[PDB]
Structures are given as structure tokens and as C-alpha cells.
Amino acid sequence: QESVKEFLAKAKEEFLKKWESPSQNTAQLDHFDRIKTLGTFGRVMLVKHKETGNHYAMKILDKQKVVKLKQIEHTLNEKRILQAVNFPFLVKLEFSFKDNSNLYMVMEYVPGGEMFSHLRRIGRFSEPHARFYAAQIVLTFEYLHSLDLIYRDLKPENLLIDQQGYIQVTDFGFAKRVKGRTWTLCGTPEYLAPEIILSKGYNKAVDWWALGVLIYEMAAGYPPFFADQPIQIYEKIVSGKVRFPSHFSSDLKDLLRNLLQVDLTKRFGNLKNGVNDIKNHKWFATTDWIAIYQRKVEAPFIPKFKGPGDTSNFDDYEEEEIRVSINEKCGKEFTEF
Ligand SMILES: c1ccc2[nH]c([C@H]3CCNC3)nc2c1
Ligand SMILES: c1ccc2[nH]c([C@H]3CCNC3)nc2c1
Ligand SMILES: c1ccc2[nH]c([C@H]3CCNC3)nc2c1
Ligand SMILES: c1ccc2[nH]c([C@H]3CCNC3)nc2c1
């Protein structure tokens, strides 16, 4: 429909304007009080802005560890993409800056915690609930792929639950703008498509594979391919073999056989009809795509928390000091940050 085509055209216009002239140096560390570590070359911390009282989540990266871990390009991708995107299900970057030792990305604080903890607490999500979360990922990937972006890190730990029970996707450390194919070995083993494992050039089809893994994990309670050694996981991934729990609906099994298709040229999301083969699949027949986008659907649950600074839905980590040098490190490498 022209309304969808027009929405995506305007989304690409606005993304490219920020992509081509990125914001830089929009706050400083002294503006924020440190509250707590929320997750941990990098860590995410709850902070409070000292003039407004607003809470934020601040991702901190040690430049010397980024260089040593060969993540320079990836770190630059992450910040340049995050400052340029805008979508209801993506965590919003509010500020960014750097100092002699570190890089800082200050994002909205999403207080309901990671999907992963709620999934492991309940055990599994029933199909209607898994479908609600999957619909948000389908819309988010339609948006990102239309901007020539590949996300490359879908998993429950990267999906935060907001105050209305909707998903906010976080962690763009492997996201990349790609016009044709890309080649980097990256991602999380359980979620990798066969073409990444086999060292091929690959494209946005890897995100649709990962959506297949995520839907399976939400509805079963565990991912389809697992083992103690990564090489064993990879052997299962490339084999073409998946076993489904008997409680899966027939429609769910059908969708997952088409997402978990080892031949990328046959995989749903990567065919002539693109995302519409997924949106029109029978498993999504009850989904009101516009109502989801507009946040008009009652969520599966609302996270329990006491206020905008409550951290109860996140776990406890050792509170470590940040590194502080009197000399600038890696200045040339991070000039554009
Ligand atoms: C998160 C982590 C570390 C932080 N240190 C600070 C201030 C303290 C004095 N100058 C910077 N805000 C932080 C927020
Ligand atoms: C419409 C368009 C873009 C939007 N960005 C957001 C923020 C709030 C939750 N995370 C991103 N809401 C939007 C609504
Ligand atoms: C905002 C609030 C909390 C957040 N936790 C994270 C990462 C940590 C690893 N998986 C999610 N990003 C956040 C953004
Ligand atoms: C807190 C205390 C001691 C610290 N030393 C350092 C850097 C300086 C040279 N290499 C270590 N950051 C610190 C933060």
C-alpha cells in the first residue's frame, strides 16, 4: 500500500539526514550521577541527570579494550546508527560523548528488564504472547532493512520490556549498514544463520533466521540448536534438522520451517515478497499490524516496578571503577565518535 511505501520512504529520508551529519559530543560525564550497574569491553549503568532528575541507561566502553578486541568499526557503527534511527520499538539514544579513556552512549532507561529474565522465570511464552513480541520484531526489521541496516544480534537478552509491556531493542554493537553482502563473523552462536557459520557473504536474511530462533525459544523455552561447544551448535545449525515440541501449533511449525530454512535464497523474509510473506503467514492471522505499531494492544504482561529509577528487574553485578587517564587514548581511531 502507498501508505506503507510512503512511511518507509520518509523513514529513510530522516535516517539519511542524521546518518550523513551525525551528532557528537552532546553531554559530558559530570552531568550525570552514577546509580547502579545494570549489565556487564563494556558495561551499562543506571545514571541520573543532575539538572533534570531524569534517569538514563549509560553504555560505557573502554577505548583501549575496543582496539584490542578489534571492535573499532563495530563501535563506530553502533553509535552512528543509534543516533540516526527512530522507531517505537528501538531504544532511543539521548546523548553521546567521549573522554580520554572511554566512549559513552546515554540511552533511555527501560525499567522492565530483559525479556530473557521473564522468559526464564515463566518457562515459556504461550503462542499468543510469543506472537505479540514477534510482531514487534517483524515491524522493527522491516524498518531497519528498509534503511539497508542488518541488526545481527537478536536474542532475548537484547530485548527490554517497557512500562507498557512492549519491546525496546537494545545493543546495536553488531549492527551495520550494508548495500549488498557483508562478511564478518559475529553474533551469538545459538542465533547464527548457516551462511555466517560457513564464512559466506551474507545479507538481511540472517536477521530472519535469527527471528526463527527467537520465536522457537519464546514458545518452547529453549532454543532449537544448543550444545556445550560452539562447534557442536554449528553442526546442528548447518544440518537442516529441527525438532519441534508437540505442543507447537501446525501454523507455528510451518512458519519456523520457512524462517529456519538453511538455503538463504528460499528463506522467508528474503523472497520476492520480502516481509509480506511473514506478515501474511497464517500464524499471524490474528495480528493487527497497525494496532501493534500504534501500541494499542494490551500487552501479555506489565513489568512490576516502583518508579522510573527502580532497578529490581535487573540483576546485581560487582560495582567496578571506571578507568581514568590524564592522557587521551586512541584519539585517531575514534575521531568520528
Ligand atoms: C556513570 C559512571 C561513572 C560516573 N562518574 C560520574 C561523575 C562523577 C564526577 N565526574 C563524573 N558520573 C558517572 C556516571
Ligand atoms: C513513534 C515513532 C518513533 C518513536 N520512538 C519512540 C521512543 C519511545 C520508546 N523507544 C523509542 N517512540 C516512538 C513513537
Ligand atoms: C537500557 C537499559 C538497560 C539495558 N541493558 C542493556 C544491555 C546489556 C546486555 N543486554 C542488554 N542495554 C540497556 C539499555
Ligand atoms: C580509579 C583509581 C585508579 C585508577 N588508575 C587508572 C588508570 C590511570 C593509568 N592506568 C590506570 N584509573 C583509575 C581510576
mmCIF file of C-alpha atoms and ligand atoms in Angstrom:
data_model
loop_
_atom_site.group_PDB
_atom_site.id
_atom_site.type_symbol
_atom_site.label_atom_id
_atom_site.label_comp_id
_atom_site.label_asym_id
_atom_site.label_seq_id
_atom_site.Cartn_x
_atom_site.Cartn_y
_atom_site.Cartn_z
ATOM 1 C CA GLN A 1 0.000 0.000 0.000
ATOM 2 C CA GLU A 2 1.154 3.502 -0.743
ATOM 3 C CA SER A 3 0.773 4.460 2.914
ATOM 4 C CA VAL A 4 3.372 1.851 3.880
ATOM 5 C CA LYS A 5 5.656 2.786 0.966
ATOM 6 C CA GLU A 6 5.369 6.454 1.984
ATOM 7 C CA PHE A 7 6.066 5.695 5.642
ATOM 8 C CA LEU A 8 9.249 3.817 4.746
ATOM 9 C CA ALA A 9 10.363 6.488 2.262
ATOM 10 C CA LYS A 10 10.038 9.182 4.895
ATOM 11 C CA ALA A 11 11.778 6.935 7.428
ATOM 12 C CA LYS A 12 14.738 6.579 5.052
ATOM 13 C CA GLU A 13 14.839 10.364 4.388
ATOM 14 C CA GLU A 14 15.055 11.146 8.095
ATOM 15 C CA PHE A 15 17.604 8.390 8.805
ATOM 16 C CA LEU A 16 19.891 9.566 5.972
ATOM 17 C CA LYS A 17 19.901 13.171 7.153
ATOM 18 C CA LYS A 18 21.285 12.106 10.562
ATOM 19 C CA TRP A 19 23.481 9.359 9.023
ATOM 20 C CA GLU A 20 25.241 11.930 6.842
ATOM 21 C CA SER A 21 25.713 14.517 9.655
ATOM 22 C CA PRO A 22 25.962 12.614 12.956
ATOM 23 C CA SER A 23 25.543 14.310 16.296
ATOM 24 C CA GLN A 24 28.667 14.307 18.513
ATOM 25 C CA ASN A 25 29.640 15.469 21.986
ATOM 26 C CA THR A 26 26.156 16.285 23.275
ATOM 27 C CA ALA A 27 26.737 15.932 27.064
ATOM 28 C CA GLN A 28 29.580 15.215 29.497
ATOM 29 C CA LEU A 29 30.094 12.695 32.302
ATOM 30 C CA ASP A 30 29.880 15.369 35.061
ATOM 31 C CA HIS A 31 26.241 15.964 34.057
ATOM 32 C CA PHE A 32 25.198 12.533 35.475
ATOM 33 C CA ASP A 33 25.308 10.804 38.880
ATOM 34 C CA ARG A 34 26.200 7.063 38.817
ATOM 35 C CA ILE A 35 23.441 4.868 40.364
ATOM 36 C CA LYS A 36 23.999 1.139 39.608
ATOM 37 C CA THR A 37 25.425 -1.349 37.111
ATOM 38 C CA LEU A 38 22.600 -2.875 35.014
ATOM 39 C CA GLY A 39 24.617 -5.255 32.808
ATOM 40 C CA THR A 40 28.275 -6.064 32.044
ATOM 41 C CA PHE A 41 34.924 -4.175 26.845
ATOM 42 C CA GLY A 42 31.723 -2.523 28.208
ATOM 43 C CA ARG A 43 29.050 -2.115 30.888
ATOM 44 C CA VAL A 44 25.623 -0.473 31.104
ATOM 45 C CA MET A 45 24.853 1.731 34.140
ATOM 46 C CA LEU A 46 21.766 3.456 35.504
ATOM 47 C CA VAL A 47 22.529 7.189 35.829
ATOM 48 C CA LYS A 48 20.531 10.282 36.857
ATOM 49 C CA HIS A 49 20.915 13.632 35.105
ATOM 50 C CA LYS A 50 21.880 16.109 37.816
ATOM 51 C CA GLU A 51 19.889 19.101 36.487
ATOM 52 C CA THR A 52 16.640 17.449 35.361
ATOM 53 C CA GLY A 53 16.430 14.412 37.634
ATOM 54 C CA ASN A 54 15.772 12.208 34.597
ATOM 55 C CA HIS A 55 17.109 8.611 34.637
ATOM 56 C CA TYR A 56 19.019 7.123 31.709
ATOM 57 C CA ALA A 57 20.995 3.998 30.877
ATOM 58 C CA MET A 58 24.653 4.753 30.023
ATOM 59 C CA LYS A 59 26.742 2.272 27.995
ATOM 60 C CA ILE A 60 30.475 2.741 28.726
ATOM 61 C CA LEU A 61 33.242 1.329 26.517
ATOM 62 C CA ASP A 62 36.958 1.352 27.357
ATOM 63 C CA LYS A 63 38.721 2.538 24.175
ATOM 64 C CA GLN A 64 41.841 0.500 24.768
ATOM 65 C CA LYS A 65 39.758 -2.695 25.081
ATOM 66 C CA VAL A 66 37.817 -1.898 21.915
ATOM 67 C CA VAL A 67 41.033 -1.574 19.921
ATOM 68 C CA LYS A 68 42.481 -4.766 21.449
ATOM 69 C CA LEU A 69 39.258 -6.680 20.793
ATOM 70 C CA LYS A 70 39.188 -5.391 17.158
ATOM 71 C CA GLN A 71 35.803 -3.735 17.615
ATOM 72 C CA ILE A 72 36.662 -0.238 16.326
ATOM 73 C CA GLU A 73 34.481 -0.364 13.197
ATOM 74 C CA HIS A 74 31.654 -2.097 15.120
ATOM 75 C CA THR A 75 31.699 0.552 17.872
ATOM 76 C CA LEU A 76 31.584 3.357 15.309
ATOM 77 C CA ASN A 77 28.676 1.550 13.518
ATOM 78 C CA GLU A 78 26.732 1.247 16.791
ATOM 79 C CA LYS A 79 26.855 4.914 17.699
ATOM 80 C CA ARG A 80 26.327 6.241 14.142
ATOM 81 C CA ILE A 81 23.272 4.007 13.645
ATOM 82 C CA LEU A 82 21.754 4.675 17.069
ATOM 83 C CA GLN A 83 21.934 8.446 16.660
ATOM 84 C CA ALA A 84 20.153 8.172 13.308
ATOM 85 C CA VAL A 85 17.238 5.709 13.844
ATOM 86 C CA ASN A 86 13.762 6.458 15.265
ATOM 87 C CA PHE A 87 11.126 3.709 15.708
ATOM 88 C CA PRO A 88 8.680 2.820 18.506
ATOM 89 C CA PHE A 89 10.469 -0.454 19.400
ATOM 90 C CA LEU A 90 14.117 0.785 19.351
ATOM 91 C CA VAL A 91 15.782 2.196 22.480
ATOM 92 C CA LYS A 92 16.369 5.924 21.934
ATOM 93 C CA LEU A 93 19.899 7.385 22.149
ATOM 94 C CA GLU A 94 19.660 10.653 24.098
ATOM 95 C CA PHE A 95 23.343 11.764 24.291
ATOM 96 C CA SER A 96 26.867 10.606 23.394
ATOM 97 C CA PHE A 97 30.390 11.761 24.233
ATOM 98 C CA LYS A 98 33.943 10.511 24.896
ATOM 99 C CA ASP A 99 36.818 11.312 27.232
ATOM 100 C CA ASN A 100 40.495 10.369 27.434
ATOM 101 C CA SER A 101 39.709 6.706 28.254
ATOM 102 C CA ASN A 102 36.116 5.848 27.384
ATOM 103 C CA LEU A 103 33.212 6.146 24.948
ATOM 104 C CA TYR A 104 29.708 6.886 26.347
ATOM 105 C CA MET A 105 26.230 6.296 24.868
ATOM 106 C CA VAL A 106 23.353 7.581 27.050
ATOM 107 C CA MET A 107 20.040 5.908 26.187
ATOM 108 C CA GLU A 108 16.519 5.824 27.560
ATOM 109 C CA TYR A 109 16.256 3.682 30.709
ATOM 110 C CA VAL A 110 13.750 0.831 30.108
ATOM 111 C CA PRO A 111 12.799 -0.336 33.608
ATOM 112 C CA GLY A 112 11.094 -3.679 32.955
ATOM 113 C CA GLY A 113 14.324 -5.681 32.436
ATOM 114 C CA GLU A 114 15.439 -8.070 29.717
ATOM 115 C CA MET A 115 12.937 -10.415 28.063
ATOM 116 C CA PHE A 116 15.385 -13.201 28.921
ATOM 117 C CA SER A 117 14.703 -12.963 32.655
ATOM 118 C CA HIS A 118 10.897 -13.009 32.231
ATOM 119 C CA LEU A 119 11.145 -15.954 29.787
ATOM 120 C CA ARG A 120 13.296 -17.971 32.164
ATOM 121 C CA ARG A 121 11.090 -17.039 35.156
ATOM 122 C CA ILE A 122 7.859 -18.248 33.497
ATOM 123 C CA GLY A 123 9.439 -21.057 31.485
ATOM 124 C CA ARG A 124 7.925 -20.356 28.059
ATOM 125 C CA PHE A 125 5.531 -17.858 26.477
ATOM 126 C CA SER A 126 2.262 -19.170 25.158
ATOM 127 C CA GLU A 127 1.832 -18.677 21.352
ATOM 128 C CA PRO A 128 -0.402 -15.564 21.588
ATOM 129 C CA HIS A 129 2.201 -13.894 23.800
ATOM 130 C CA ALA A 130 5.174 -15.021 21.686
ATOM 131 C CA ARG A 131 3.258 -13.696 18.619
ATOM 132 C CA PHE A 132 2.794 -10.242 20.197
ATOM 133 C CA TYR A 133 6.564 -9.907 20.768
ATOM 134 C CA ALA A 134 7.401 -11.444 17.349
ATOM 135 C CA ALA A 135 5.112 -8.947 15.578
ATOM 136 C CA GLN A 136 7.151 -6.081 17.069
ATOM 137 C CA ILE A 137 10.400 -7.639 15.814
ATOM 138 C CA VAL A 138 8.883 -8.132 12.314
ATOM 139 C CA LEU A 139 7.951 -4.427 12.142
ATOM 140 C CA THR A 140 11.362 -3.375 13.552
ATOM 141 C CA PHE A 141 13.270 -5.456 10.960
ATOM 142 C CA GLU A 142 11.028 -4.135 8.151
ATOM 143 C CA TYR A 143 12.115 -0.624 9.242
ATOM 144 C CA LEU A 144 15.831 -1.439 9.694
ATOM 145 C CA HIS A 145 16.152 -3.440 6.485
ATOM 146 C CA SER A 146 14.490 -0.611 4.511
ATOM 147 C CA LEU A 147 17.384 1.605 5.695
ATOM 148 C CA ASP A 148 19.873 -1.023 4.440
ATOM 149 C CA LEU A 149 20.672 -1.967 8.062
ATOM 150 C CA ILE A 150 21.319 -5.506 9.330
ATOM 151 C CA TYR A 151 20.891 -5.951 13.110
ATOM 152 C CA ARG A 152 22.859 -9.216 13.700
ATOM 153 C CA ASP A 153 22.288 -9.691 17.452
ATOM 154 C CA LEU A 154 18.692 -10.759 18.010
ATOM 155 C CA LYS A 155 18.259 -12.711 21.297
ATOM 156 C CA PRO A 156 16.105 -12.325 24.447
ATOM 157 C CA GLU A 157 18.863 -10.585 26.403
ATOM 158 C CA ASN A 158 18.804 -7.700 23.873
ATOM 159 C CA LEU A 159 15.021 -7.096 24.087
ATOM 160 C CA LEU A 160 13.956 -4.903 27.020
ATOM 161 C CA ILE A 161 10.361 -4.737 28.313
ATOM 162 C CA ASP A 162 8.954 -1.218 28.733
ATOM 163 C CA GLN A 163 6.356 0.206 31.153
ATOM 164 C CA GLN A 164 3.517 -0.732 28.748
ATOM 165 C CA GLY A 165 4.883 -4.287 28.212
ATOM 166 C CA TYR A 166 6.247 -3.578 24.716
ATOM 167 C CA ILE A 167 9.759 -4.442 23.442
ATOM 168 C CA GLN A 168 12.631 -1.990 23.077
ATOM 169 C CA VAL A 169 15.571 -3.423 21.099
ATOM 170 C CA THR A 170 18.940 -2.521 22.575
ATOM 171 C CA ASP A 171 22.581 -3.251 21.783
ATOM 172 C CA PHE A 172 23.496 -2.236 18.252
ATOM 173 C CA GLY A 173 27.134 -3.324 18.650
ATOM 174 C CA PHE A 174 26.910 -5.665 15.632
ATOM 175 C CA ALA A 175 24.514 -3.571 13.529
ATOM 176 C CA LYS A 176 25.806 -2.416 10.128
ATOM 177 C CA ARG A 177 24.716 -0.503 7.035
ATOM 178 C CA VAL A 178 25.105 -2.946 4.110
ATOM 179 C CA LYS A 179 24.147 -2.378 0.459
ATOM 180 C CA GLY A 180 24.682 -5.931 -0.827
ATOM 181 C CA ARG A 181 26.532 -8.534 1.300
ATOM 182 C CA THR A 182 28.804 -8.470 4.367
ATOM 183 C CA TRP A 183 31.312 -10.985 5.738
ATOM 184 C CA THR A 184 32.142 -10.514 9.483
ATOM 185 C CA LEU A 185 31.924 -13.465 11.843
ATOM 186 C CA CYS A 186 29.866 -12.005 14.695
ATOM 187 C CA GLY A 187 26.760 -12.638 16.748
ATOM 188 C CA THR A 188 25.799 -15.173 19.338
ATOM 189 C CA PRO A 189 26.331 -18.901 18.437
ATOM 190 C CA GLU A 190 22.807 -20.208 19.054
ATOM 191 C CA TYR A 191 21.412 -17.479 16.750
ATOM 192 C CA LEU A 192 23.826 -17.612 13.796
ATOM 193 C CA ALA A 193 22.483 -18.450 10.313
ATOM 194 C CA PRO A 194 24.290 -21.219 8.376
ATOM 195 C CA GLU A 195 25.788 -18.737 5.907
ATOM 196 C CA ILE A 196 27.616 -16.896 8.743
ATOM 197 C CA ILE A 197 28.998 -20.197 10.104
ATOM 198 C CA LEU A 198 30.166 -21.232 6.605
ATOM 199 C CA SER A 199 32.049 -17.938 6.088
ATOM 200 C CA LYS A 200 29.927 -16.847 3.133
ATOM 201 C CA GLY A 201 28.895 -13.356 2.165
ATOM 202 C CA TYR A 202 25.504 -12.787 3.765
ATOM 203 C CA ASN A 203 22.680 -10.232 3.949
ATOM 204 C CA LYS A 204 19.466 -9.341 5.865
ATOM 205 C CA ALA A 205 18.280 -12.966 5.602
ATOM 206 C CA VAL A 206 20.436 -13.673 8.687
ATOM 207 C CA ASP A 207 18.057 -11.500 10.776
ATOM 208 C CA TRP A 208 15.043 -13.528 9.558
ATOM 209 C CA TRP A 209 16.844 -16.760 10.510
ATOM 210 C CA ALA A 210 17.504 -15.271 13.959
ATOM 211 C CA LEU A 211 13.768 -14.383 14.251
ATOM 212 C CA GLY A 212 13.038 -18.075 13.673
ATOM 213 C CA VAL A 213 15.405 -18.994 16.540
ATOM 214 C CA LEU A 214 13.844 -16.336 18.807
ATOM 215 C CA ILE A 215 10.242 -17.432 18.137
ATOM 216 C CA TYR A 216 11.201 -21.062 18.773
ATOM 217 C CA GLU A 217 12.954 -20.097 22.039
ATOM 218 C CA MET A 218 9.999 -17.979 23.240
ATOM 219 C CA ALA A 219 7.415 -20.713 22.523
ATOM 220 C CA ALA A 220 9.488 -23.730 23.620
ATOM 221 C CA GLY A 221 11.501 -22.249 26.488
ATOM 222 C CA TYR A 222 14.851 -23.186 24.944
ATOM 223 C CA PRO A 223 16.470 -22.502 21.540
ATOM 224 C CA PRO A 224 16.398 -25.072 18.725
ATOM 225 C CA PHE A 225 20.203 -25.582 18.435
ATOM 226 C CA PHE A 226 22.293 -25.929 21.603
ATOM 227 C CA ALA A 227 25.340 -27.765 22.989
ATOM 228 C CA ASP A 228 28.324 -27.126 25.241
ATOM 229 C CA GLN A 229 30.801 -26.388 22.425
ATOM 230 C CA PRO A 230 30.141 -23.778 19.718
ATOM 231 C CA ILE A 231 31.371 -26.196 17.021
ATOM 232 C CA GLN A 232 28.646 -28.646 18.091
ATOM 233 C CA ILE A 233 25.991 -25.906 17.852
ATOM 234 C CA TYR A 234 27.246 -25.037 14.386
ATOM 235 C CA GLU A 235 26.998 -28.652 13.217
ATOM 236 C CA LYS A 236 23.335 -28.719 14.275
ATOM 237 C CA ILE A 237 22.622 -25.341 12.601
ATOM 238 C CA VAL A 238 24.047 -26.371 9.248
ATOM 239 C CA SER A 239 22.375 -29.833 9.237
ATOM 240 C CA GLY A 240 18.951 -28.697 8.131
ATOM 241 C CA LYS A 241 17.308 -30.580 11.047
ATOM 242 C CA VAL A 242 14.986 -29.089 13.682
ATOM 243 C CA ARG A 243 12.645 -30.930 16.074
ATOM 244 C CA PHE A 244 9.535 -29.197 17.315
ATOM 245 C CA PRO A 245 7.689 -29.715 20.627
ATOM 246 C CA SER A 246 4.405 -31.496 20.070
ATOM 247 C CA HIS A 247 2.534 -28.562 21.614
ATOM 248 C CA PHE A 248 3.580 -26.230 18.787
ATOM 249 C CA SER A 249 0.638 -25.399 16.505
ATOM 250 C CA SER A 250 0.830 -26.577 12.906
ATOM 251 C CA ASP A 251 0.934 -22.953 11.747
ATOM 252 C CA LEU A 252 3.906 -22.198 14.037
ATOM 253 C CA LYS A 253 5.841 -25.228 12.743
ATOM 254 C CA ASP A 254 5.166 -24.116 9.175
ATOM 255 C CA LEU A 255 6.414 -20.583 9.811
ATOM 256 C CA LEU A 256 9.534 -21.832 11.601
ATOM 257 C CA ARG A 257 10.448 -24.292 8.775
ATOM 258 C CA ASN A 258 10.406 -21.273 6.419
ATOM 259 C CA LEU A 259 12.412 -18.959 8.735
ATOM 260 C CA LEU A 260 14.873 -21.756 9.698
ATOM 261 C CA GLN A 261 15.472 -22.558 6.019
ATOM 262 C CA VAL A 262 19.162 -23.338 5.537
ATOM 263 C CA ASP A 263 19.183 -22.127 1.896
ATOM 264 C CA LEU A 264 19.075 -18.325 2.237
ATOM 265 C CA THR A 265 17.569 -17.989 -1.266
ATOM 266 C CA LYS A 266 14.468 -19.874 -0.025
ATOM 267 C CA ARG A 267 14.101 -18.272 3.412
ATOM 268 C CA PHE A 268 11.060 -16.248 4.356
ATOM 269 C CA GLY A 269 11.846 -12.541 4.523
ATOM 270 C CA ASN A 270 14.359 -12.954 1.664
ATOM 271 C CA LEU A 271 11.947 -13.777 -1.207
ATOM 272 C CA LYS A 272 10.323 -11.551 -3.850
ATOM 273 C CA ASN A 273 7.536 -10.553 -1.421
ATOM 274 C CA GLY A 274 10.024 -9.699 1.396
ATOM 275 C CA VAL A 275 8.480 -9.152 4.831
ATOM 276 C CA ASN A 276 4.952 -9.681 3.498
ATOM 277 C CA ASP A 277 5.452 -13.460 3.304
ATOM 278 C CA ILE A 278 5.862 -13.327 7.098
ATOM 279 C CA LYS A 279 3.132 -10.770 7.850
ATOM 280 C CA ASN A 280 0.568 -12.744 5.728
ATOM 281 C CA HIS A 281 1.507 -16.154 7.163
ATOM 282 C CA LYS A 282 -1.375 -17.998 8.914
ATOM 283 C CA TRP A 283 0.452 -17.920 12.280
ATOM 284 C CA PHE A 284 -0.011 -14.117 12.242
ATOM 285 C CA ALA A 285 -3.683 -14.161 11.126
ATOM 286 C CA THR A 286 -4.854 -12.626 14.442
ATOM 287 C CA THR A 287 -2.205 -9.830 14.384
ATOM 288 C CA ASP A 288 -3.408 -6.250 13.808
ATOM 289 C CA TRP A 289 -0.140 -4.832 12.436
ATOM 290 C CA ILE A 290 -1.268 -1.184 12.673
ATOM 291 C CA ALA A 291 -2.590 -1.621 16.245
ATOM 292 C CA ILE A 292 0.767 -3.129 17.284
ATOM 293 C CA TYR A 293 2.717 -0.252 15.683
ATOM 294 C CA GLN A 294 0.385 2.277 17.408
ATOM 295 C CA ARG A 295 0.778 0.493 20.799
ATOM 296 C CA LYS A 296 -2.994 -0.054 21.075
ATOM 297 C CA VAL A 297 -2.860 -3.771 22.006
ATOM 298 C CA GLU A 298 -2.912 -4.853 25.663
ATOM 299 C CA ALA A 299 0.447 -6.475 26.319
ATOM 300 C CA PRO A 300 0.976 -10.038 27.705
ATOM 301 C CA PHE A 301 2.090 -8.514 30.999
ATOM 302 C CA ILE A 302 3.177 -5.257 32.558
ATOM 303 C CA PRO A 303 6.527 -5.474 34.421
ATOM 304 C CA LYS A 304 6.326 -4.831 38.147
ATOM 305 C CA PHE A 305 8.457 -1.867 39.257
ATOM 306 C CA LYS A 306 8.062 1.030 41.650
ATOM 307 C CA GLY A 307 9.199 4.051 39.653
ATOM 308 C CA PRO A 308 11.446 5.347 36.889
ATOM 309 C CA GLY A 309 14.609 4.619 38.914
ATOM 310 C CA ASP A 310 13.692 1.128 40.141
ATOM 311 C CA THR A 311 16.297 -1.496 39.150
ATOM 312 C CA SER A 312 14.562 -4.569 40.635
ATOM 313 C CA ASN A 313 14.060 -6.182 37.217
ATOM 314 C CA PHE A 314 17.839 -6.159 36.579
ATOM 315 C CA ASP A 315 20.371 -8.306 38.346
ATOM 316 C CA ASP A 316 23.277 -7.470 40.673
ATOM 317 C CA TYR A 317 26.866 -7.067 39.431
ATOM 318 C CA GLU A 318 30.130 -6.092 41.092
ATOM 319 C CA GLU A 319 30.353 -2.277 41.094
ATOM 320 C CA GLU A 320 33.661 -1.542 39.394
ATOM 321 C CA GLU A 321 35.501 1.714 38.945
ATOM 322 C CA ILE A 322 35.770 3.381 35.534
ATOM 323 C CA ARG A 323 39.280 3.867 34.130
ATOM 324 C CA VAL A 324 40.539 7.455 34.147
ATOM 325 C CA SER A 325 43.671 8.580 32.348
ATOM 326 C CA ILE A 326 45.259 12.028 32.201
ATOM 327 C CA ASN A 327 46.328 11.283 28.594
ATOM 328 C CA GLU A 328 43.999 10.790 25.606
ATOM 329 C CA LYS A 329 43.923 7.194 24.303
ATOM 330 C CA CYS A 330 43.098 6.090 20.747
ATOM 331 C CA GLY A 331 42.218 9.596 19.617
ATOM 332 C CA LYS A 332 42.660 8.957 15.888
ATOM 333 C CA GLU A 333 40.710 5.701 15.937
ATOM 334 C CA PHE A 334 37.596 7.308 17.486
ATOM 335 C CA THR A 335 37.759 10.773 15.873
ATOM 336 C CA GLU A 336 34.271 10.409 14.404
ATOM 337 C CA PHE A 337 32.613 9.238 17.637
HETATM 338 C C1 LIG B 1 28.321 6.797 35.439
HETATM 339 C C2 LIG B 1 29.528 6.243 35.738
HETATM 340 C C3 LIG B 1 30.542 6.987 36.292
HETATM 341 C C4 LIG B 1 30.312 8.300 36.530
HETATM 342 N N1 LIG B 1 31.175 9.254 37.073
HETATM 343 C C5 LIG B 1 30.450 10.425 37.102
HETATM 344 C C6 LIG B 1 30.857 11.769 37.540
HETATM 345 C C7 LIG B 1 31.478 11.853 38.936
HETATM 346 C C8 LIG B 1 32.333 13.099 38.837
HETATM 347 N N2 LIG B 1 32.632 13.297 37.398
HETATM 348 C C9 LIG B 1 31.939 12.290 36.586
HETATM 349 N N3 LIG B 1 29.142 10.210 36.563
HETATM 350 C C10 LIG B 1 29.089 8.842 36.197
HETATM 351 C C11 LIG B 1 28.066 8.124 35.660
HETATM 352 C C1 LIG B 2 6.843 6.768 17.170
HETATM 353 C C2 LIG B 2 7.944 6.933 16.397
HETATM 354 C C3 LIG B 2 9.194 6.812 16.928
HETATM 355 C C4 LIG B 2 9.267 6.601 18.263
HETATM 356 N N1 LIG B 2 10.416 6.473 19.087
HETATM 357 C C5 LIG B 2 9.887 6.220 20.417
HETATM 358 C C6 LIG B 2 10.742 6.018 21.614
HETATM 359 C C7 LIG B 2 9.982 5.630 22.895
HETATM 360 C C8 LIG B 2 10.262 4.168 23.063
HETATM 361 N N2 LIG B 2 11.588 3.969 22.434
HETATM 362 C C9 LIG B 2 11.702 4.865 21.298
HETATM 363 N N3 LIG B 2 8.503 6.207 20.361
HETATM 364 C C10 LIG B 2 8.166 6.444 19.040
HETATM 365 C C11 LIG B 2 6.950 6.527 18.500
HETATM 366 C C1 LIG B 3 18.767 0.396 28.652
HETATM 367 C C2 LIG B 3 18.508 -0.213 29.896
HETATM 368 C C3 LIG B 3 19.090 -1.419 30.229
HETATM 369 C C4 LIG B 3 19.911 -2.004 29.289
HETATM 370 N N1 LIG B 3 20.591 -3.215 29.292
HETATM 371 C C5 LIG B 3 21.307 -3.338 28.104
HETATM 372 C C6 LIG B 3 22.104 -4.469 27.585
HETATM 373 C C7 LIG B 3 23.039 -5.248 28.461
HETATM 374 C C8 LIG B 3 23.188 -6.532 27.661
HETATM 375 N N2 LIG B 3 21.860 -6.829 27.094
HETATM 376 C C9 LIG B 3 21.075 -5.583 27.233
HETATM 377 N N3 LIG B 3 21.015 -2.182 27.319
HETATM 378 C C10 LIG B 3 20.146 -1.369 28.097
HETATM 379 C C11 LIG B 3 19.598 -0.184 27.729
HETATM 380 C C1 LIG B 4 40.484 4.945 39.822
HETATM 381 C C2 LIG B 4 41.600 4.660 40.573
HETATM 382 C C3 LIG B 4 42.834 4.424 39.983
HETATM 383 C C4 LIG B 4 42.913 4.488 38.617
HETATM 384 N N1 LIG B 4 44.003 4.287 37.769
HETATM 385 C C5 LIG B 4 43.577 4.474 36.470
HETATM 386 C C6 LIG B 4 44.387 4.395 35.237
HETATM 387 C C7 LIG B 4 45.452 5.500 35.106
HETATM 388 C C8 LIG B 4 46.669 4.841 34.440
HETATM 389 N N2 LIG B 4 46.220 3.464 34.147
HETATM 390 C C9 LIG B 4 45.262 3.157 35.237
HETATM 391 N N3 LIG B 4 42.188 4.812 36.512
HETATM 392 C C10 LIG B 4 41.797 4.785 37.887
HETATM 393 C C11 LIG B 4 40.589 5.010 38.453
#
